[PDB]
Symmetry: C3
Subunit: 25 residues, 3 copies
Amino acid sequence: NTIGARLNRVEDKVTQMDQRMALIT
Amino acid sequence: SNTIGARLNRVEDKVTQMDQRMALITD
Amino acid sequence: NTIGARLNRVEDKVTQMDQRMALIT
């Protein structure tokens, strides 16, 4: 897959883990 | 070893493992 | 912005959150 595609996928994922975080801690 | 591409690789590895450990912290 | 800054910002975020998880497990 493309770097453009991969980069986007990781920016959102980090964003998702951050929200799972926020709801706990 | 340090192109945007090689570093992307590392950052997705870290993200992958981090996402699992996370299932142990919360849903 | 650029692909470089975007990768930097994401490394930045991943790093901050790893230290937060490292405290727990």
